[PDB]
């Protein structure tokens, strides 16, 4: 089970952690032509790492990878204006479908 | 609008280009004329009539 | 789009939440309208061509007519 | 949506855009026309000026308290 | 103000798996896999879905950002979403 | 510089405390000829001007003054 | 489902009855007795002293001898 | 004649807002937008007859609380300094009110973002034509429901109801202190009129018993309604509230927060002089907030890349220099700064809000970028306000600031001392931050998406017109306002303002000074553009910095997150409040 | 005639 | 039945209310009672009548209000001592 | 333009060289030379 | 009748009454009931009229008994509003209740006017006997005038917070789906509250001139002088 | 999934003394530079006597005994 579980779960956490260090990458590099340069650099971090077979030592590698991560990630990052967490979310929802409106509620007898 | 690749651009219609460019030069003018007004006496070069 | 008429032909939803009355009849009122309406009224009435017209007595207009009576009178 | 159509609201709900619109909108600007008269009116009896104006103010056409309060020494 | 026909999805992201150094466009078809059809990195699967995000102006939730490992699947998300 | 503005002239010109300095008599023609230009700042530059004048000679023979009070002040400390 | 009432959720509704009865769950331990010797017999005595000697205050700054508030 | 100008906008909001269903959304901006506008043309009439006309009109319509002394009628009072807030609150709303005819043309709850604006207007000018404590306190206390309700416009989103929220609750303490000056003023004078407080503002030589301390009476009243103004005008203590409430719609943000409400503050201060001017101690705390205000802004605002936020703390930096301006007993030069900055910084919001609405609401500056040559009109109307707000010679913001910081250098005292020199530095960070925002959003090589640059439009004619407007405003008016407000001995201001004369330095202020001290703003304003340039156009971007040296993140953090003021004041005020209420009130009592 | 003059003398009537 | 006019309260202490022992006829106590509000209110609607002078001294003159109005403002603070109800200064009267 | 990740992203963004959105220091200042000619024609008639 | 008894148990009122009116106001916050957030607004408003009673002033006495008619309009209108959300929807919880703005607008009018009244905004003839009652306590008191004031604060916290949760924001379809704003009845009910609390608020010399003759001869009854 | 008794009222990188300290810090920044304003004792260099104006300072014109 290890072989396709305690390897593979490895296997993408490491893909969260190379996709939020690119977009915060892009984040504190706001220039596009500066942009390119540091995420090369990014992912030759990662790169010069996949000699590895062995949990015994990768494991504690990802660790400091998140904690290194968690150190340098932007205070404030960019958020899609619609995207959750954004300034243009909930603006002007679609309202909830199904809610009915009842008439006369209130009329004796 | 013109396209390079996919993306276009919609080019503006002459009254804001027109109005733009003629309010800067009114800025740009009235800065150098009152310049050439009060300048030395913004300097410190002469008084307005003090001495 | 400052000339186009409307498309909503009357204010979406009824007022008071009432189904409008059957055509060439009239909204029946309830038991407690009436009543309810007169005294909405008599309230008004009183209180408008009562307070208005009661004579305006009090302690600060009968001591304003004093004062500015003896406040000339040391002079 | 679609239940919103059926919520009565004073100010008129959303995308409110009435077929005479325009008739309402004269109706109303004319009746605060007639409800600003009386307003105009009652400012141009309570407002107090104790100073002369410098020139000839446009105001000197309906008010009359022009340099009346000179003699405040026999305010009430 | 229209949402974009799933056809013109598929161009732009065929477009943009076509405009990759590593890979091969000779043939990119829709239904292809990443790792199995025209055998890549990992990591470069990540930076693909990304340049999908910014080319349509979405923002995917990062948990299922990694389920896209198919041209197949990117269309089909980029397409189901109403912002976008 | 003696006053030439006398106390009642000041009050009917109604000029406020603090400009009743030793520049007050200039100020009255160039506070009636601010009124009658709107308070534009290109009318009224004759009058401006000798009034700013005034208050530039005051300022100037305050800082002499202040000036030569210091000198004094320096001079018998180091010299004690 | 044609009743105007509320479909009363099993969490929400205990939540509420438990942040209602919490008449018996005082148990007199040394923090209610902080809680309850502090901010119910401390803080009552430093405001009355407080209005107290601001009378007295008042009093002194006229002249007339403190009056006997009590 | 003068009751219309108060009551117009009432009419308005009280027809857009009853009877809005058969207006539509284009009755209920016709309705409002007229009202509004005729109530500006109103006060332009009462600008030229009570300000240049030299005939002051005092209004009496009834009694309102008439206890044995406590008589607080509803008074208007229309003098100089009345009249220039009315020429600037009703031309401001009712530019505002046409932007919005075009901003709001696809919101559907138009009708009531404008009666809210126009119950704003009427409330904003129930604070300035107030004869009263009371009176003012009415308006001051509406205007700031006002705002509450024109934050969270759009109540769905969650960010604007707790924006609102910490609004009004900062607003409130601010209100208490009011209303302590309030009841301290009538403790003394047993009257809450101006004209008698201001008459018999100087007999009053006694102590009080305050709070178990013997105090002065006046100085602690000024104090008092001092703080007030610090809950208003989002000083030192107490101005989280501003940046957060950027929330609502541009349109709110140039109304209530650039133009108006926080000059409220301001306005209160330089009405309340002739009371001001008798405690010395006051005007230390007052110049003493006012210069922290002024730097802690601009040390703020200098790494924020939300467009809106940047906007913000550059009106925060130039209410604490219209602030510590009172505090050196200069209150004409505040209210000519007021009245400046309330020109080109209502056409950068509306300019910046322009921006936004075209880019697809995109904020973010480190998402746009190469607009200048696709929107023309709003990058030059840009630049005019940028210039403006740095302070470019021989402009708007020339007249006025460079003033603000001459005269602080002539009050020889330890409080001017420290008010100059943060002006001074505050100087060279807003011309740092507005730079970069004038770079970031107009002129670095493009950084935005494809589909925000292909859906793109200019401003309309509904938007466009109250920025031309605006434009010659912050062109022309400084100049044209230059004399009759800041002159030496001018009497337009008449009574509405008093110096004593042992206080007033206008006349040191020009001729006393070195001419480096009259060039230190145009120099530190080029420094700040300089480096503006080098950090963003042309720069190898050293930022590895920021990820390698633990100290610039922490730095960079700080300025971020607001000097860490939110947080903090959070979980050291809020929090343990909330706490207390539940844990010791309710759980043992 | 006019309806203040009927209520004032009725209400100092009514006192 | 009242008449027409302001209420006529007659001028004059009760006879009868000798202060050293106020609990003796109660019947002058309240008589008493209702005449020093009596005197309060007159001296407190005299006191309002210099504020309106003194107000309208402030808007007439202008700068010249701290010369011109010196006679009134102290005239109003000194009839402000003993207004009635209010800060500890009680009058004596 | 360096490396397998710079390559790409930078072969992407061969749109942002726009030629209405390339270059826009050429419009920094709008209308500065229409306001100098306007300047230097009032500066030479008056006298 | 004890007015030697009054003032010697002066301060003691002063602290009770500035005490309740701060644990009180905090206590508020944390209530998830809709009548019990309410019953808690007239503790803090009942202990604030008992320290203008006791100032024994004119300010004093005179604005607490017009701040009890405010309170018994105000309160008595939120516990209407209260009934008719109850009536429709048989539940009290603040939790089951929101986003009522888009199918209950004119209740929500109605319920943010009475909240603005509750809070002492001017205009209201809540703000009139509140400051009435201040001017009335710091002519007497300094301290306990400042105690006071920070009811308001806490009172203008939890009666806008209530209102942001139960009117303002998202519907929830899961819990409850239909709606019926007010009725014939209801809005006819809240009408002579709406023109009563107004009326108090920007004219209360009708109901003041009535009792300063009456509230006069209660302020000294003992004094003799 | 029972809710929580306090579920009423429910800048990641810091905590909150830490926070607090750094505010410390950036407020202490005023007040060294008060200190240093108080150091420099601007008074003391004024350079110009202060202000006399005529007929006693304005005594008649400030409020003054005639
Ligand atoms: C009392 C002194 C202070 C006065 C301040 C006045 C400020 C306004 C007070 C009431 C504001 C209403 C806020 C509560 C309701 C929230 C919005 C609402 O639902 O109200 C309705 C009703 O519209 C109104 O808001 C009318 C109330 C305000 C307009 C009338 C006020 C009259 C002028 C102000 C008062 C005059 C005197 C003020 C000075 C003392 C609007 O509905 P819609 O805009 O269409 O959107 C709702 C969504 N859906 C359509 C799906 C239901
Ligand atoms: C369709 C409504 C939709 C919502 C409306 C929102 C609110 C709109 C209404 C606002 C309030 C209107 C009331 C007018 C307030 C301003 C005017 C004050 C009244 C006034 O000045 O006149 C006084 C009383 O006369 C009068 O005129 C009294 C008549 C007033 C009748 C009011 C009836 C209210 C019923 C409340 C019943 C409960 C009462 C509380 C226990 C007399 O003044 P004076 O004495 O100085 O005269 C001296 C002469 N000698
Ligand atoms: C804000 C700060 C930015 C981030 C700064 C840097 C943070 C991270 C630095 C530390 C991270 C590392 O070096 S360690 C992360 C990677 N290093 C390794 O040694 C992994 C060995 N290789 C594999 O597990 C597989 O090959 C796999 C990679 C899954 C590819 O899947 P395929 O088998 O199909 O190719």
Same mark, same amino acid.
């Given at each position: 089970?290890?072989?396709?579980?305690?390897?593979?779960?490895?296997?993408?956490?490491?893909?969260?952690?190379?996709?939020?260090?690119?977009?915060?990458?892009?984040?504190?590099?706001?220039?596009?032509?500066?942009?390119?340069?540091?995420?090369?650099?990014?992912?030759?971090?990662?790169?010069?790492?996949?000699?590895?077979?062995?949990?015994?030592?990768?494991?504690?590698?990802?660790?400091?990878?998140?904690?290194?991560?968690?150190?340098?990630?932007?205070?404030?990052?960019?958020?899609?204006?619609?995207?959750?967490?954004?300034?243009?979310?909930?603006?002007?929802?679609?309202?909830?479908?199904?809610?009915?409106?009842?008439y006369?509620?209130?009329?004796?007898? | 609008?013109?396209?390079?690749?996919?993306?276009?651009?919609?080019?503006?219609?002459?009254?804001?280009?027109?109005?733009?460019?003629?309010?800067?030069?009114?800025?740009?003018?009235?800065?150098?004329?009152?310049?050439?007004?009060?300048?030395?006496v913004?300097?410190?070069?002469?008084?307005?009539?003090?001495? | 789009?400052?000339? !186009?008429?409307?498309?909503?032909?009357?204010?979406? /939803?009824?007022?008071? %939440?009432?189904? =409008?009355?059957?055509?060439g009849?009239?909204?029946?009122?309830?038991?407690?309208?009436l009543?309810?309406?007169? !005294?909405?009224?008599?309230?008004?009435?009183?209180? /408008?061509?009562?307070? %208005?017209?009661? =004579?305006?007595?009090?302690?600060?207009?009968?001591?304003?007519?004093?004062?500015?009576?003896?406040?000339?009178?040391?002079? | 949506?679609?239940?919103?159509?059926?919520?009565?609201?004073?100010?008129?709900?959303?995308?409110?855009?009435?077929?005479?619109?325009?008739?309402?909108?004269?109706?109303?600007?004319?009746?605060?026309?007639?409800?600003?008269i009386?307003?105009?009116?009652?400012?141009?009896?309570?407002?107090?000026?104790?100073?002369?104006?410098?020139?000839?103010?446009?105001?000197?056409?309906?008010?009359?308290?022009?340099?009346?309060?000179?003699?405040?020494?026999?305010?009430? | 103000?229209?949402?974009?026909?799933?056809?013109?999805?598929?161009?732009?992201?065929?477009?943009?798996?076509?405009?990759?150094?590593?890979?091969?466009?000779?043939?990119?078809?829709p239904?292809?896999?990443?790792?199995?059809?025209?055998?890549?990195?990992?990591?470069?699967?990540?930076?693909?879905?990304?340049?999908?995000?910014?080319?349509?102006?979405?923002?995917?939730?990062?948990?299922?950002?990694?389920?896209?490992?198919?041209?197949?699947?990117?269309?089909?998300?980029?397409?189901?979403?109403?912002?976008? | 510089?003696?006053?030439?503005?006398?106390?009642?002239?000041?009050?009917?010109?109604?000029?406020?405390?603090?400009?009743?300095?030793?520049?007050?008599?200039?100020?009255?023609?160039?506070?009636?000829?601010?009124?009658?230009?709107?308070?534009?700042?290109?009318?009224?530059?004759?009058?401006?001007?000798?009034?700013?004048?005034?208050?530039?000679?005051?300022?100037?023979?305050?800082?002499?003054?202040?000036?030569?009070?210091?000198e004094?002040?320096?001079?018998?400390?180091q010299?004690? | 489902?044609?009743?105007?009432?509320?479909?009363?959720?099993?969490?929400?509704?205990?939540?509420?009855?438990?942040?209602?009865?919490?008449?018996?769950?005082?148990?007199?331990?040394?923090?209610?007795?902080?809680?309850?010797?502090?901010?119910?017999?401390?803080?009552?005595?430093?405001?009355?002293?407080?209005?107290?000697?601001?009378?007295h205050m008042?009093?002194?700054?006229?002249?007339?001898?403190?009056?006997?508030?009590? | 004649?003068?009751?219309?100008?108060?009551?117009?906008?009432?009419?308005?909001?009280?027809?857009?807002?009853?009877?809005?269903?058969?207006?539509?959304?284009?009755?209920?901006?016709?309705?409002?937008?007229?009202?509004?506008?005729?109530?500006?043309?109103?006060?332009?009439?009462?600008?030229?007859?009570?300000?240049?006309?030299?005939?002051?009109?005092?209004?009496?319509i009834?009694?309102?609380?008439?206890?044995?002394?406590?008589?607080?009628?509803?008074?208007?009072?229309?003098?100089?300094?009345?009249?220039?807030?009315?020429?600037?609150?009703?031309?401001?709303?009712?530019?505002?009110?046409?932007?919005?005819?075009?901003?709001?043309?696809?919101?559907?709850?138009?009708?009531?973002?404008?009666?809210?604006?126009?119950?704003?207007?009427?409330?904003?000018?129930?604070?300035?034509t107030?004869?009263?404590?009371?009176?003012?306190?009415?308006?001051?206390?509406?205007?700031g429901?006002?705002?509450?309700?024109?934050?969270?416009?759009?109540?769905?989103?969650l960010?604007?109801?707790?924006?609102?929220?910490?609004?009004?609750?900062?607003?409130?303490?601010g209100?208490?202190?009011?209303?302590?000056?309030?009841?301290?003023?009538?403790?003394?004078?047993?009257?809450?009129?101006?004209?008698?407080?201001?008459?018999?503002?100087?007999?009053?030589?006694?102590?009080?018993?305050?709070?178990?301390?013997?105090?002065?009476?006046?100085?602690?009243?000024?104090?008092?309604?001092?703080?007030?103004?610090?809950?208003?005008?989002?000083?030192?203590?107490?101005?989280?509230?501003?940046?957060?409430?950027?929330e609502?719609?541009?349109?709110?943000?140039?109304?209530?927060?650039?133009?108006?409400?926080?000059?409220?503050?301001?306005?209160?201060?330089?009405?309340?002089?002739?009371?001001?001017?008798?405690?010395?101690?006051?005007?230390?705390?007052?110049?003493?907030?006012?210069?922290?205000?002024?730097?802690?802004?601009?040390?703020?605002?200098?790494?924020?890349?939300?467009?809106?936020?940047?906007?913000?703390?550059?009106?925060?930096?130039?209410l604490?220099?219209?602030?510590f301006?009172?505090?050196?007993?200069?209150?004409?030069?505040?209210?000519?700064?007021?009245?400046?900055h309330?020109?080109?910084?209502?056409?950068?919001?509306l300019?910046?809000?322009?921006?936004?609405?075209?880019?697809?609401?995109?904020?973010?500056?480190?998402?746009?970028?190469?607009?200048?040559?696709?929107?023309?009109?709003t990058?030059?109307?840009?630049?005019?306000?940028?210039?403006?707000?740095?302070?470019?010679?021989?402009?708007?913001?020339?007249?006025?600031?460079?003033?603000?910081?001459?005269?602080?250098?002539?009050?020889?005292?330890?409080?001017?001392?420290?008010?100059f020199?943060?002006?001074?530095?505050?100087?060279?960070?807003?011309?740092?931050?507005?730079?970069?925002?004038?770079?970031?959003?107009?002129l670095?090589?493009?950084?935005?998406?494809?589909?925000?640059?292909?859906?793109?439009?200019?401003?309309?004619?509904?938007?466009?017109?109250?920025?031309?407007?605006?434009?010659?405003?912050?062109?022309?008016?400084?100049?044209?306002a230059?004399?009759?407000?800041?002159?030496?001995?001018?009497?337009?201001?008449?009574?509405?303002?008093?110096?004593?004369?042992?206080?007033?330095?206008?006349?040191?202020?020009?001729?006393?000074?070195?001419?480096?001290?009259?060039?230190?703003?145009?120099?530190?304003?080029?420094?700040?553009?300089?480096?503006?340039?080098?950090?963003?156009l042309?720069?190898?971007?050293?930022?590895?910095?920021?990820?390698?040296?633990?100290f610039?993140?922490?730095?960079?953090?700080?300025?971020?997150?607001?000097?860490?003021?939110?947080?903090?004041?959070?979980?050291?005020?809020?929090?343990?409040?909330?706490?207390?209420?539940?844990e010791?009130?309710?759980?043992?009592? | 005639?006019?309806?203040?003059?009927?209520?004032?003398?009725?209400?100092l009537?009514?006192? | 039945?009242?008449?027409?006019?302001?209420?006529?309260?007659?001028?004059?202490?009760?006879?009868?209310?000798?202060?050293?022992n106020?609990?003796?006829?109660?019947?002058?106590?309240?008589?008493?009672?209702?005449?020093?509000?009596?005197?309060?209110?007159?001296?407190?609607?005299?006191?309002?009548?210099?504020?309106?002078?003194?107000?309208?001294?402030?808007?007439?003159?202008?700068?010249?209000?701290?010369?011109?109005?010196?006679?009134?403002?102290?005239?109003?603070?000194?009839?402000?001592?003993?207004?009635?109800?209010?800060?500890?200064?009680?009058?004596?009267? | 333009?360096?490396?397998?990740?710079?390559?790409?992203?930078?072969?992407?963004?061969?749109?942002?060289?726009?030629?209405?959105?390339?270059?826009?220091?050429?419009?920094?200042?709008?209308?500065?030379?229409?306001?100098?000619?306007?300047?230097?024609?009032?500066?030479?008639?008056?006298? | 009748?004890?007015?030697?008894?009054?003032?010697?148990?002066?301060?003691?009122?002063?602290?009770?009454?500035?005490?309740?009116?701060?644990?009180?106001?905090?206590?508020?916050?944390?209530?998830?009931?809709?009548?019990?957030?309410?019953?808690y607004?007239?503790?803090?408003?009942?202990?604030?009229?008992?320290?203008?009673?006791?100032?024994?002033?004119?300010?004093?006495?005179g604005?607490?008994?017009?701040?009890?008619?405010?309170?018994?309009?105000?309160?008595?209108?939120?516990?209407?509003?209260?009934?008719?959300?109850?009536?429709?929807?048989?539940?009290?919880?603040?939790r089951?209740?929101?986003?009522?703005?888009?199918?209950?607008?004119?209740?929500?009018?109605?319920?943010?006017?009475?909240?603005?009244?509750?809070?002492?905004?001017?205009?209201?003839?809540?703000?009139?006997?509140?400051?009435?009652?201040?001017?009335?306590?710091?002519?007497?008191?300094?301290?306990?005038?400042?105690?006071?004031a920070?009811?308001?604060?806490?009172?203008?916290?939890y009666?806008?917070?209530?209102?942001?949760?139960?009117?303002?924001?998202?519907?929830?379809?899961?819990?409850?789906?239909?709606?019926?704003?007010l009725?014939?009845?209801?809005?006819?009910?809240?009408?002579?509250?709406?023109?009563?609390?107004?009326?108090?608020?920007?004219?209360?010399?009708?109901?003041?001139?009535?009792?300063?003759?009456?509230?006069?001869?209660?302020?000294?009854?003992?004094?003799?002088? | 999934?029972?809710?929580?008794?306090?579920?009423?009222?429910?800048?990641?990188?810091?905590?909150?003394?830490?926070?607090?300290?750094?505010?410390?810090?950036?407020?202490?920044?005023?007040?060294?530079?008060?200190?240093?304003?108080?150091?420099?004792?601007?008074?003391?260099?004024?350079?110009?006597?202060?202000?006399?104006?005529?007929?006693?300072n304005?005594?008649?014109?400030?409020?003054?005994?005639?």
């Open positions: 089970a290890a072989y396709f579980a305690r390897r593979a779960a490895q296997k993408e956490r490491v893909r969260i952690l190379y996709r939020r260090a690119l977009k915060d990458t892009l984040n504190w590099a706001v220039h596009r032509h500066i942009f390119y340069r540091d995420a090369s650099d990014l992912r030759e971090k990662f790169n010069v790492n996949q000699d590895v077979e062995d949990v015994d030592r990768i494991d504690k590698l990802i660790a400091h990878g998140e904690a290194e991560y968690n150190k340098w990630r932007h205070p404030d990052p960019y958020i899609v204006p619609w995207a959750p967490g954004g300034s243009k979310f909930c603006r002007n929802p679609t309202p909830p479908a199904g809610i009915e409106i009842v006369n509620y209130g009329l004796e007898d | 609008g013109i396209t390079y690749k996919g993306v276009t651009v919609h080019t503006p219609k002459t009254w804001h280009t027109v109005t733009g460019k003629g309010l800067c030069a009114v800025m740009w003018f009235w800065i150098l004329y009152r310049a050439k007004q009060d300048g030395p913004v300097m410190g070069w002469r008084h307005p009539w003090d001495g | 789009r400052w000339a !186009t008429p409307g498309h909503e032909e009357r204010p979406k /939803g009824y007022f008071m %939440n009432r189904t =409008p009355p059957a055509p009849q009239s909204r029946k009122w309830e038991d407690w309208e009543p309810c309406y007169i !005294t909405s009224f008599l309230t008004i009435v009183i209180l /408008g061509v009562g307070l %208005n017209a009661k =004579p305006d007595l009090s302690i600060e207009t009968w001591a304003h007519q004093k004062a500015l009576e003896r406040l000339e009178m040391e002079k | 949506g679609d239940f919103r159509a059926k919520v009565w609201s004073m100010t008129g709900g959303p995308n409110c855009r009435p077929k005479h619109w325009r008739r309402n909108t004269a109706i109303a600007m004319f009746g605060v026309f007639l409800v600003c009386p307003i105009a009116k009652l400012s141009a009896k309570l407002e107090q000026r104790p100073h002369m104006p410098v020139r000839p103010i446009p105001s000197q056409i309906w008010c009359k308290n022009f340099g009346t309060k000179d003699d405040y020494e026999k305010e009430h | 103000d229209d949402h974009l026909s799933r056809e013109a999805v598929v161009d732009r992201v065929l477009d943009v798996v076509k405009s990759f150094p590593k890979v091969d466009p000779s043939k990119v078809t239904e292809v896999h990443f790792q199995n059809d025209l055998g890549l990195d990992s990591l470069d699967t990540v930076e693909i879905v990304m340049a999908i995000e910014e080319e349509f102006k979405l923002e995917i939730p990062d948990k299922e950002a990694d389920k896209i490992d198919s041209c197949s699947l990117a269309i089909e998300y980029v397409y189901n979403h109403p912002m976008s | 510089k003696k006053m030439i503005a006398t106390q009642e002239e000041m009050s009917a010109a109604k000029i406020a405390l603090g400009s009743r300095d030793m520049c007050a008599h200039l100020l009255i023609p160039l506070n009636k000829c601010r009124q009658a230009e709107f308070y534009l700042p290109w009318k009224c530059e004759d009058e401006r001007h000798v009034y700013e004048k005034c208050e530039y000679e005051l300022v100037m023979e305050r800082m002499l003054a202040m000036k030569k009070i210091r004094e002040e320096a001079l018998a400390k010299n004690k | 489902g044609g009743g105007m009432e509320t479909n009363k959720n099993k969490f929400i509704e205990d939540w509420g009855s438990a942040r209602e009865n919490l008449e018996h769950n005082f148990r007199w331990t040394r923090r209610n007795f902080a809680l309850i010797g502090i901010f119910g017999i401390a803080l009552p005595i430093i405001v009355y002293k407080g209005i107290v000697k601001d009378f008042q009093d002194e700054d006229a002249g007339r001898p403190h009056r006997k508030f009590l | 004649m003068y009751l219309l100008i108060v009551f117009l906008p009432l009419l308005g909001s009280s027809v857009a807002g009853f009877f809005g269903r058969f207006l539509g959304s284009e009755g209920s901006a016709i309705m409002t937008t007229t009202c509004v506008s005729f109530s500006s043309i109103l006060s332009l009439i009462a600008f030229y007859e009570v300000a240049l006309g030299a005939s002051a009109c005092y209004l009496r009834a009694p309102w609380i008439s206890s044995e002394m406590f008589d607080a009628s509803w008074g208007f009072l229309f003098d100089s300094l009345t009249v220039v807030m009315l020429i600037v609150v009703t031309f401001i709303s009712s530019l505002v009110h046409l932007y919005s005819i075009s901003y709001m043309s696809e919101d559907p709850h138009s009708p009531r973002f404008m009666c809210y604006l126009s119950i704003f207007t009427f409330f904003m000018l129930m604070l300035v107030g004869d009263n404590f009371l009176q003012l306190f009415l308006g001051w206390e509406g205007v429901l006002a705002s509450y309700l024109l934050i969270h416009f759009w109540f769905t989103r960010q604007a109801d707790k924006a609102a929220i910490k609004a009004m609750l900062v607003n409130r303490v209100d208490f202190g009011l209303a302590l000056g309030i009841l301290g003023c009538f403790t003394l004078f047993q009257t809450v009129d101006f004209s008698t407080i201001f008459a018999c503002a100087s007999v009053p030589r006694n102590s009080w018993i305050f709070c178990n301390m013997r105090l002065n009476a006046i100085s602690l009243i000024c104090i008092l309604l001092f703080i007030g103004a610090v809950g208003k005008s989002a000083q030192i203590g107490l101005h989280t509230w501003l940046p957060d409430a950027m609502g719609p541009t349109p709110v943000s140039a109304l209530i927060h650039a133009a108006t409400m926080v000059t409220a503050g301001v306005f209160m201060i330089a009405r309340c002089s002739p009371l001001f001017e008798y405690s010395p101690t006051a005007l230390i705390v007052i110049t003493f907030a006012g210069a922290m205000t002024s730097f802690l802004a601009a040390t703020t605002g200098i790494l924020q890349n939300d467009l809106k936020r940047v906007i913000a703390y550059s009106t925060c930096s130039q604490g220099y219209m602030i301006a009172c505090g050196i007993s200069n209150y004409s030069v505040s209210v000519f700064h007021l009245m400046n309330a020109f080109f910084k209502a056409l950068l919001f300019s910046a809000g322009s921006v936004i609405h075209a880019m697809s609401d995109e904020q973010d500056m480190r998402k746009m970028g190469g607009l200048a040559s696709s929107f023309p009109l990058y030059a109307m840009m630049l005019i306000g940028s210039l403006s707000l740095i302070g470019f010679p021989f402009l708007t913001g020339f007249y006025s600031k460079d003033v603000i910081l001459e005269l602080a250098y002539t009050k020889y005292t330890i409080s001017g001392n420290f008010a020199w943060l002006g001074s530095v505050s100087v060279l960070f807003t011309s740092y931050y507005s730079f970069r925002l004038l770079f970031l959003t107009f670095v090589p493009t950084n935005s998406f494809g589909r925000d640059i292909s859906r793109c439009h200019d401003a309309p004619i509904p938007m466009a017109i109250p920025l031309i407007l605006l434009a010659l405003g912050s062109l022309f008016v400084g100049y044209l230059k004399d009759m407000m800041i002159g030496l001995g001018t009497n337009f201001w008449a009574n509405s303002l008093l110096v004593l004369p042992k206080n007033e330095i206008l006349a040191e202020s020009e001729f006393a000074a070195p001419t480096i001290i009259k060039l230190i703003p145009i120099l530190f304003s080029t420094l700040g553009a300089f480096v503006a340039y080098n950090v963003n042309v720069a190898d971007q050293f930022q590895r910095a920021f990820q390698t040296s633990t610039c993140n922490r730095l960079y953090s700080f300025f971020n997150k607001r000097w860490f003021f939110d947080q903090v004041l959070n979980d050291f005020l809020v929090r343990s409040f909330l706490r207390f209420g539940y010791v009130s309710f759980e043992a009592l | 005639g006019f309806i203040m003059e009927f209520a004032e003398n009725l209400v009537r009514l006192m | 039945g009242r008449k027409k006019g302001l209420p006529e309260f007659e001028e004059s202490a009760p006879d009868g209310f000798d202060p050293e106020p609990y003796k006829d109660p019947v002058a106590m309240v008589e008493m009672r209702e005449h020093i509000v009596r005197e309060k209110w007159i001296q407190i609607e005299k006191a309002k009548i210099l504020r309106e002078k003194v107000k309208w001294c402030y808007r007439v003159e202008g700068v010249n209000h701290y010369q011109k109005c010196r006679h009134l403002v102290q005239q109003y603070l000194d009839s402000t001592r003993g207004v009635g109800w209010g800060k500890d200064h009680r009058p004596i009267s | 333009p360096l490396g397998t990740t710079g390559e790409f992203f930078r072969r992407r963004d061969e749109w942002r060289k726009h030629p209405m959105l390339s270059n826009q220091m050429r419009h920094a200042l709008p209308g500065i030379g229409i306001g100098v000619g306007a300047f230097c024609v009032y500066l030479v008639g008056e006298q | 009748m004890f007015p030697e008894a009054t003032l010697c148990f002066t301060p003691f009122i002063y602290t009770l009454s500035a005490i309740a009116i701060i644990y009180t106001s905090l206590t508020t916050l944390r209530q998830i009931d809709l009548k019990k957030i309410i019953a607004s007239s503790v803090a408003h009942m202990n604030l009229v008992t320290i203008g009673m006791f100032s024994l002033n004119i300010q004093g006495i604005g607490s008994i017009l701040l009890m008619l405010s309170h018994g309009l105000v309160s008595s209108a939120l516990f209407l509003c209260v009934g008719v959300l109850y009536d429709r929807h048989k539940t009290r919880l603040v089951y209740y929101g986003g009522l703005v888009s199918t209950m607008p004119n209740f929500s009018t109605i319920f943010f006017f009475f909240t603005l009244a509750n809070m002492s905004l001017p205009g209201t003839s809540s703000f009139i006997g509140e400051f009435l009652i201040l001017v009335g306590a710091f002519q007497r008191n300094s301290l306990v005038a400042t105690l006071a920070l009811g308001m604060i806490l009172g203008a916290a009666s806008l917070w209530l209102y942001n949760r139960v009117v303002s924001g998202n519907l929830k379809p899961d819990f409850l789906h239909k709606f019926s704003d009725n014939g009845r209801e809005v006819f009910i809240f009408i002579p509250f709406l023109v009563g609390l107004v009326w108090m608020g920007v004219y209360p010399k009708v109901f003041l001139d009535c009792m300063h003759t009456s509230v006069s001869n209660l302020v000294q009854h003992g004094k003799f002088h | 999934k029972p809710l929580s008794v306090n579920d009423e009222l429910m800048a990641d990188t810091v905590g909150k003394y830490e926070a607090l300290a750094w505010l410390s810090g950036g407020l202490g920044f005023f007040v060294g530079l008060g200190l240093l304003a108080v150091l420099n004792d601007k008074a003391s260099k004024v350079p110009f006597t202060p202000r006399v104006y005529p007929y006693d304005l005594r008649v014109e400030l409020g003054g005994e005639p």
